[PDB]
Design an enzyme around this catalytic site. Structure first.
Site, short mmCIF file in Angstrom:
data_model
loop_
_atom_site.label_atom_id
_atom_site.label_comp_id
_atom_site.label_asym_id
_atom_site.label_seq_id
_atom_site.Cartn_x
_atom_site.Cartn_y
_atom_site.Cartn_z
N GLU A 1 16.14 -12.95 17.27
CA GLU A 1 16.58 -12.27 18.49
C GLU A 1 15.66 -11.11 18.85
O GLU A 1 15.63 -10.71 20.02
CB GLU A 1 18.02 -11.79 18.32
CG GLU A 1 18.88 -11.99 19.55
CD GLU A 1 20.34 -11.66 19.31
OE1 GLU A 1 20.90 -12.14 18.30
OE2 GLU A 1 20.93 -10.92 20.13
N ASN B 1 7.97 10.57 6.59
CA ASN B 1 8.65 9.35 6.19
C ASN B 1 10.16 9.43 6.38
O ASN B 1 10.79 8.42 6.73
CB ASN B 1 8.31 9.02 4.74
CG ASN B 1 6.86 8.63 4.57
OD1 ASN B 1 6.19 8.31 5.56
ND2 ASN B 1 6.37 8.65 3.34
N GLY C 1 0.80 -1.20 0.00
CA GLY C 1 0.00 0.00 0.00
C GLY C 1 0.84 1.26 0.00
O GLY C 1 2.07 1.24 0.07
N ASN D 1 0.97 8.04 13.49
CA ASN D 1 1.18 9.25 12.71
C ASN D 1 1.03 10.51 13.56
O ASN D 1 1.69 11.52 13.30
CB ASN D 1 0.22 9.30 11.52
CG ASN D 1 0.81 8.69 10.26
OD1 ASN D 1 2.02 8.45 10.18
ND2 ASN D 1 -0.04 8.45 9.27
N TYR E 1 3.81 13.97 4.03
CA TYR E 1 4.23 12.57 4.04
C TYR E 1 5.74 12.45 3.91
O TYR E 1 6.36 11.59 4.54
CB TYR E 1 3.52 11.80 2.92
CG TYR E 1 2.13 11.38 3.29
CD1 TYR E 1 1.85 10.92 4.57
CD2 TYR E 1 1.08 11.46 2.38
CE1 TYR E 1 0.58 10.54 4.93
CE2 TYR E 1 -0.20 11.08 2.73
CZ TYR E 1 -0.44 10.62 4.01
OH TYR E 1 -1.72 10.24 4.37
N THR F 1 -5.63 -1.53 1.37
CA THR F 1 -4.57 -2.46 1.00
C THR F 1 -3.65 -2.75 2.18
O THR F 1 -3.37 -3.91 2.49
CB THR F 1 -3.76 -1.90 -0.17
OG1 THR F 1 -4.64 -1.63 -1.27
CG2 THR F 1 -2.69 -2.89 -0.61
N1 LIG Z 1 3.50 7.97 7.74
C1 LIG Z 1 2.86 7.81 6.59
N2 LIG Z 1 1.52 7.49 6.59
C2 LIG Z 1 0.87 7.33 5.42
C3 LIG Z 1 1.53 7.48 4.21
N3 LIG Z 1 0.62 7.26 3.22
C4 LIG Z 1 -0.58 6.98 3.79
N4 LIG Z 1 -0.44 7.04 5.15
C5 LIG Z 1 -1.48 6.77 6.16
O1 LIG Z 1 -2.08 5.53 5.84
C6 LIG Z 1 -3.49 5.60 5.98
C7 LIG Z 1 -4.13 5.45 4.61
O2 LIG Z 1 -3.82 4.20 4.05
P1 LIG Z 1 -2.92 4.02 2.74
O3 LIG Z 1 -1.61 3.32 3.06
O4 LIG Z 1 -2.68 5.33 2.03
O5 LIG Z 1 -3.91 3.13 1.83
P2 LIG Z 1 -3.44 1.82 1.02
O6 LIG Z 1 -2.62 0.88 1.88
O7 LIG Z 1 -2.68 2.23 -0.22
O8 LIG Z 1 -4.84 1.10 0.68
P3 LIG Z 1 -5.85 1.65 -0.45
O9 LIG Z 1 -5.35 2.94 -1.06
O10 LIG Z 1 -7.20 1.82 0.21
O11 LIG Z 1 -5.95 0.58 -1.52
C8 LIG Z 1 -3.80 6.97 6.56
O12 LIG Z 1 -3.82 6.87 7.96
C9 LIG Z 1 -2.60 7.79 6.13
O13 LIG Z 1 -2.34 8.84 7.03
C10 LIG Z 1 2.89 7.79 4.20
O14 LIG Z 1 3.51 7.93 3.15
N5 LIG Z 1 3.54 7.96 5.40
#
Ligand SMILES: Nc1nc2c(ncn2[C@@H]2O[C@H](COP(=O)(O)OP(=O)(O)OP(=O)(O)O)[C@@H](O)[C@H]2O)c(=O)[nH]1
Ligand SMILES: CC/C=C\[C@H](C)[C@H](OC(N)=O)[C@@H](C)[C@H](O)[C@@H](C)C/C(C)=C\[C@H](C)[C@@H](O)[C@@H](C)/C=C\[C@@H](O)C[C@@H]1OC(=O)CC[C@H]1C
Ligand SMILES: Nc1ncnc2c1ncn2[C@@H]1O[C@H](COP(=O)(O)OP(=O)(O)CP(=O)(O)O)[C@@H](O)[C@H]1O
Ligand SMILES: Nc1nc2c(ncn2[C@@H]2O[C@H](COP(=O)(O)OP(=O)(O)O)[C@@H](O)[C@H]2O)c(=O)[nH]1
Ligand SMILES: [Mg+2]
Ligand SMILES: [Mg+2]
Ligand SMILES: [Mg+2]
Lengths: 54, 313, 438, 425
Positions: free
Chosen positions: C254, C228, C10, C206, C224, C145
């Site tokens: 471990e 990250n 994802g 987050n 982001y 995802t």
């Molecule tokens: N720290 C961080 N959080 C992220 C990032 N991208 C998305 N999120 C968090 O992840 C959550 C959203 O899920 P995503 O990972 O974007 O969605 P996905 O796994 O791609 O699943 P779908 O898009 O629904 O198919 C939210 O809470 C966002 O704040 C990122 O690059 N860094």
């Protein structure tokens, strides 16, 4: 206080400090769950088309 | 506009505090379970501190210090004093934690008093016995009974002193300048009758104004010198001991809390700590003044719109 | 030398994975084109960094990584970014339409159709390993995802790699930066299904990362990218023991041995210090005592909670830079007296310490100043249960009205899975209570 | 790509649709001939959502124009951006629908619907990954209302796993063409309850009051109402047309906005709403009026109900920290009007590109239980006539029976009751 297990190398070192002592689903099962969900989707879709056909 | 929630309908103090908040126009009471609040007046038990300080853009304040129970539970207070180097202690009566564990350490110090005043009190239903027999048969704490209490005259009667203490989010310690003596209007019998252990004063309670006058006339001293110095010392000692464990200085939410300290005074004008109340009530004549002070010092300091002595540290 | 395969699932997992591998290359001196002048083992060798990088005859150091996302746009960043040459198409797996923030859609509807392909790609990497020790799985809790497909993948990995350890890096949802209201659902669903398949999971809230970026880096509205780069520093310090010479946390097993005595309680709390703005020209270089003391400030934790009101089961101190054991011990003795550090009675009140002399690497042009010493503390404390309680409460508010449930049933999930997952979480909260309360 | 197929049906549907494409074409830098002439690359990144790319780097809207009479679509073809539409995507008849739902749905519309579906199929089968469809229409007429909902049913049958989105103009006696509008709207609402995932409810009464009370337009025209709508439509679709994280596609938007399948009717809002002016608008001003009833286009007072979910889109260079401050502020100052059993149900997005001529703007999308007032108004007007079988002959003459009206009335009243259930929860 006691420092034990001191390992040293050119990249750094590690050790342990002690201050006090103390006092699955098989492949077939997963496939069944995925196909059962697919079946339920197909049932809901077929109902819709039956509704639209009426 | 500030928002607050009430989660203990059974509290006398904070029912008056919420009344004052609403009588200012800048505070709005929300539902019980509305998470978008500035100030929580929480429940006495099972307060969900873990859910505070996670609402974006909301500064949240709660009227209880997480962990303050270690001071306000009789058993845990005895353990706190004995196990804390800050306290180790001359102002706390000899006490032992015994489950129905310091069962043996108590008997050792007991018989060495019977062989050589050996009255104790068991509480957590109270029992004051001169022999350990019915005391042990009766989690409870066994505490040395003050057999030489300061008796008020006329009446030859016993009393305790309630001191209200407010600790704000900055861990400043404030002592309400008004305390209450809760007297027993029966002569202190020295030889099982638990009534001396509004004839003279209204409601069986005496305020500092009168008690200080009595101390001057009867004993040629003042409330401040003979008693208040010790009470202030005991309060600071107790609250400074747990400050690292309960402070919210660098925490994602903020706490304050009103405490009820209960003291007793012996005939040598020595003050003994009896217990600390975490959810105390107030004297009817003192509700208005104290509750306004809470809003001024604890709430409005965090959410802008002296009756307290500040114990420095 | 035992290889480690990283799986990024994802948007969250992919974008964090891209940030981590950038930092790895900088830490190991691997240029964007995959070349590594330091490696005299041209075309091979089994050095410590080879646990994460395979080598081609042309001298390219290729990450042992797979990227999976049901939407193309995020993974196209990888195949087009600075380190595009690092990867080959077999490592990148993309669908056409995503899970729409719907666990059921990621797990059942779409997951059923892509799982084999992902597994085929992972098998290709595993076939390249002389002694695979397990997987590191990066993903979000909130994404359809990240939640839905990850839990399916974890189930299959337990089947196809029974003996291998699996570690997670999970992004706990924060409304400050999230757009979906159903994220509490996806979080509980994926935690229930993944629980028995993960050996050690590092949760990152987050909200904590966001606040650390606002306070310590002076970024008014972190992105982001900001989040990250910081997260990848935390991940780097955690995985450094797998990639550099050392004797602490040297393999995936471990991690569980040192941090997880109770298999279900496998969510260590991470704390990191110092985080210093690169805009500040000169900052006083904090001492060992200062950065170790900072590991007990809630403000530096990856999940905001109060360890003073929980109990510790295990504690690991991971230092990078100019740190010597003498100063660590002096700092520990100091903090033990001035902090509330209650260990459970059936665990030793001690600390496992690891020091790597290379100070933390920073991305050129990033928001983080280079420091001379930094530390990451991994402590398994019952206080992290506060994160579960919060999440479970939000679940309860919506599920009591069955809000949004029809989206999940519509994809073939049964309503029973909601309650089943929620009951598993209530039991998890009971386990923390049973361990950390006097 | 995530393509959307746009359909406009009837007079109202094609006139609002014509303006919508005029507006967004300018935002994406597309001239009336389909050539790109913009200065920013942000205009082309997600341009595939609404435009096909033809030979010569020409951009053709993925739009299908439908009507049972030629008048309005001739005006479109001779309008400003008339030549930008694909000539094959004009599908029209001659008989008209006579402001008759039955004619659009059962007789006249049935003759024409297959040819529309042929065009839909051609656009859909050319999509790399079709998201779904958006329909613009009114509910008070005959073509947009009766034939539009017929199309929705047909489209769902062939594309059951696609999102169906509509911008639906609700009738009001204040801005009325025919007395049978409550009949047509009641019949259409039931269709929408079943076959759409999201429906933006646009009440002509609210649009009129905005033009009169707020904008100081003495005598508003349909042209004035339609610019409000196209401006609103441009805002609500900004998340789909430019890079962003919030509600970036139809399904994710629906998952976040629709907690219960039948309650998918949204109240939109736009800001700034100012009379003739060059004053730079501030974030508090955008936020204040965007949430004021007088800027909401469903003629429903949100203070009479509760918000299930809310999406707010801000456009133009501005401080996102101040956006959060004002957004988080208005929730706390209106705590009573947000349901507490959907945590964090107010989402906020920010897009850099502002509409032409505006430094900054704000668009509002609310799923409020107050919308039940709009359906209750329609129900009362329906029952006022139906209990006397007034004007029914126009419909029975097309083969409809009285039972279908009773059933539509029951379904409408059930929808209102369902909203009342959640306003008390
Ligand atoms: N720290 C961080 N959080 C992220 C990032 N991208 C998305 N999120 C968090 O992840 C959550 C959203 O899920 P995503 O990972 O974007 O969605 P996905 O796994 O791609 O699943 P779908 O898009 O629904 O198919 C939210 O809470 C966002 O704040 C990122 O690059 N860094
Ligand atoms: C009527 C006052 C005119 C402009 C005021 C001052 C505001 O304009 C500025 N610049 O702030 C407007 C945004 C106003 O608030 C809205 C109501 C306008 C609106 C959508 C509909 C009106 C009802 C219609 O009559 C419409 C045909 C009138 C004028 C439009 O051409 C205005 C343009 O509409 C945009 O969509 C973006 C660029 C803006 C140039
Ligand atoms: N060690 C001791 N020696 C003498 N008297 C004592 C004593 N401990 C308690 N008492 C008396 O017993 C009374 C009640 O004791 P305690 O305070 O423990 O009960 P309690 O908690 O139910 C009342 P509160 O809540 O107001 O403190 C006190 O007013 C005090 O006078
Ligand atoms: N806002 C707006 N409403 C319109 C317009 N044209 C018609 N209407 C409304 O639509 C309803 C009449 O439907 P109409 O579209 O003319 O019928 P159709 O052509 O058969 O679909 C009435 O409620 C009108 O008020 C328009 O251009 N703008
Ligand atoms: Mg008490
Ligand atoms: Mg995604
Ligand atoms: Mg008309």
């Amino acid at each position: 206080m006691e420092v034990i297990e001191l390992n040293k190398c050119t990249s750094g070192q590690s050790f342990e400090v002690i201050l006090k002592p103390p006092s699955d689903p098989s492949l077939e099962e997963i496939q069944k769950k995925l196909e059962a969900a697919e079946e339920r989707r197909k049932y809901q879709e077929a109902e819709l088309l039956k509704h639209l056909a009426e | 506009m500030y928002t607050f929630v009430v989660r203990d309908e059974n509290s006398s103090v904070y029912a008056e505090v919420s009344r004052l908040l609403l009588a200012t126009g800048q505070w709005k009471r929300l539902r019980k379970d509305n998470p978008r609040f500035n100030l929580m007046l929480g429940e006495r038990n099972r307060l969900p501190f873990g859910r505070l300080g996670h609402e974006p853009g909301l500064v949240q304040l709660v009227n209880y210090y997480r962990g303050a129970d270690k001071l306000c539970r009789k058993a845990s207070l005895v353990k706190l004093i004995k196990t804390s180097p800050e306290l180790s202690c001359t102002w706390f009566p000899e006490s032992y934690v015994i489950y129905p564990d310091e069962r043996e350490v108590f008997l050792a110090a007991y018989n060495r008093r019977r062989e050589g005043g050996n009255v104790w009190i068991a509480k957590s239903g109270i029992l004051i016995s001169s022999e350990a027999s019915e005391l042990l048969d009766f989690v409870h704490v066994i505490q040395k009974y003050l057999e030489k209490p300061l008796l008020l005259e006329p009446g030859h009667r016993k009393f305790d002193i309630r001191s209200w203490v407010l600790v704000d989010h900055l861990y400043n310690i404030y002592l309400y300048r008004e305390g209450v003596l809760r007297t027993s209007s029966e002569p202190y019998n020295s030889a099982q009758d638990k009534t001396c252990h509004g004839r003279y004063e209204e409601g069986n309670e005496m305020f500092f104004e009168e008690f200080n006058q009595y101390l001057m006339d009867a004993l040629n001293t003042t409330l401040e010198n003979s008693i208040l110095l010790q009470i202030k010392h005991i309060i600071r000692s107790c609250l400074m001991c747990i400050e690292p464990a309960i402070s919210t200085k660098h925490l994602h939410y903020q706490s304050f809390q009103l405490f009820g300290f209960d003291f007793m005074v012996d005939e040598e004008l020595k003050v003994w700590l009896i217990e600390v109340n975490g959810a105390p009530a107030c004297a009817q004549k003192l509700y208005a003044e104290l509750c306004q002070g809470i809003v001024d010092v604890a709430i409005s300091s965090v959410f802008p719109l002296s009756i307290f002595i500040k114990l420095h540290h | 030398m035992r290889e480690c395969i990283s799986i990024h699932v994802g948007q969250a997992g992919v974008q964090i994975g891209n940030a981590c591998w950038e930092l790895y290359c900088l830490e190991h001196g691997i240029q964007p084109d995959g070349q590594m002048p330091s490696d005299k083992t041209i075309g091979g060798g089994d050095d410590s960094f080879n646990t994460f990088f395979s080598e081609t005859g042309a001298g390219k150091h290729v990450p042992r990584a797979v990227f999976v996302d049901l939407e193309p746009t995020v993974i196209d960043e990888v195949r087009t970014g600075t380190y595009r040459q690092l990867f080959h198409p077999e490592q990148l797996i993309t669908g056409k339409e995503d899970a729409a923030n719907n666990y059921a859609r990621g797990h059942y509807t779409i997951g059923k159709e892509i799982i084999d392909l992902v597994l085929d790609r992972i098998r290709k990497l595993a076939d390249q390993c002389t002694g695979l020790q397990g997987f590191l799985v990066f993903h979000s809790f909130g994404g359809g995802t990240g939640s839905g497909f990850t839990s399916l993948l974890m189930e299959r990995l337990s089947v196809d790699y029974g003996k291998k350890s699996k570690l997670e890096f999970s992004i706990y949802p924060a409304p400050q930066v999230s757009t979906a209201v159903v994220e509490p659902y996806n979080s509980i669903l994926t935690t229930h299904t993944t629980l028995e398949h993960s050996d050690c999971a590092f949760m990152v809230d987050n909200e904590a990362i966001y606040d650390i970026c606002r306070r310590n880096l002076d970024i008014e509205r972190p992105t982001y990218t900001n989040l990250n780069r910081l997260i990848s520093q935390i991940v780097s310090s955690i995985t450094a023991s797998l990639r550099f010479d050392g004797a602490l946390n040297v393999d995936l097993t471990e991690f569980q041995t040192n941090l997880v005595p109770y298999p279900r309680i496998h969510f260590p709390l991470a704390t990191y210090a110092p985080v210093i703005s690169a805009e500040k020209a000169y900052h006083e270089q904090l001492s060992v005592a200062e950065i170790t003391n900072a590991c007990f400030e809630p403000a530096n934790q990856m999940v905001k909670c109060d360890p003073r009101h929980g109990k510790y089961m295990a504690c690991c101190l991971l230092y990078r830079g100019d740190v010597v054991p003498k100063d660590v011990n002096a700092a520990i003795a100091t903090i033990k007296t001035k902090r509330s550090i209650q260990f459970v009675d059936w665990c030793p009140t001690g600390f496992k310490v690891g020091i790597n002399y290379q100070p933390p690497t920073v991305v050129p042009g990033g928001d983080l100043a280079k420091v001379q010493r930094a530390v990451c503390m991994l402590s398994n404390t019952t206080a992290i249960a506060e994160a579960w309680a919060r999440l479970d409460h939000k679940f309860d508010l919506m599920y009591a009205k069955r809000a949004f449930v029809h989206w999940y049933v519509g994809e073939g999930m049964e309503e029973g899975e909601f309650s089943e997952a929620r009951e598993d979480m209530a039991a998890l909260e009971k386990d923390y209570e049973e361990v950390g309360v006097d | 790509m995530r393509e959307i197929v746009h359909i406009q049906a009837g007079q109202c549907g094609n006139q609002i649709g014509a303006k919508f494409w005029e507006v967004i074409s300018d935002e994406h830098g597309i001239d009336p001939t389909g050539s790109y002439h913009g200065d920013s690359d942000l205009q082309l990144e997600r341009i595939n959502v609404y435009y096909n790319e033809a030979t010569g780097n020409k951009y053709v809207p993925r739009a299908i124009l439908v009507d049972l009479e030629p008048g309005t679509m001739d005006s479109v073809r001779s309008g400003p951006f008339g030549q930008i539409f694909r000539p094959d995507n004009f599908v029209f008849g001659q008989s008209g629908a006579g402001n008759n739902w039955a004619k659009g749905h059962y007789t006249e519309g049935a003759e024409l619907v297959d040819s529309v579906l042929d065009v839909v199929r051609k656009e859909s089968e050319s999509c790399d990954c079709l998201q779904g469809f958006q329909l613009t229409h009114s509910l008070g007429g005959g073509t947009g209302s009766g034939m539009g909902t017929l199309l929705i049913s047909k489209i769902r049958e062939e594309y059951p796993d696609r999102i169906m989105n509509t911008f639906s103009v609700m009738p009001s006696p204040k801005v009325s063409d025919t007395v049978v509008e409550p009949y047509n709207a009641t019949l259409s609402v039931h269709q929408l309850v079943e076959n759409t995932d999201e429906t933006y409810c646009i009440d002509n009464e609210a649009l009129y009051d905005i033009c009169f009370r707020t904008l100081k337009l003495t005598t508003p025209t349909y042209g004035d109402l339609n610019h409000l709508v196209s401006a609103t439509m441009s805002g609500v679709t900004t998340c789909l047309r430019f890079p962003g994280q919030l509600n970036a596609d139809l399904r994710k938007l629906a998952v976040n906005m629709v907690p219960f399948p039948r309650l998918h009717f949204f109240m939109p809002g736009f800001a700034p709403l100012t009379s003739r002016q060059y004053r730079a608008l501030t974030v508090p001003e955008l936020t204040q009026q965007m949430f004021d009833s007088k800027n909401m286009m469903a003629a429903c007072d949100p203070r009479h109900g509760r918000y299930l979910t809310v999406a707010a889109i801000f456009r133009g260079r501005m401080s996102m920290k101040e956006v959060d401050e004002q957004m988080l502020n208005v929730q706390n100052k209106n705590s009573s009007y947000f349901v507490e059993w959907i945590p964090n149900n107010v989402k906020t997005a920010v897009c850099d590109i502002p509409p032409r001529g505006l430094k900054m703007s704000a668009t509002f999308i609310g799923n409020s239980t107050a919308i039940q007032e709009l359906f209750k108004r329609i129900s009362e007007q329906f029952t006022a006539m139906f209990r006397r079988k007034a004007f029914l002959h126009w419909y029975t003459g097309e083969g409809m029976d009285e039972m279908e009206f009773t059933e539509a009335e029951s379904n409408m009243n059930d929808l209102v009751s369902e909203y009342q259930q959640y306003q008390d929860a």
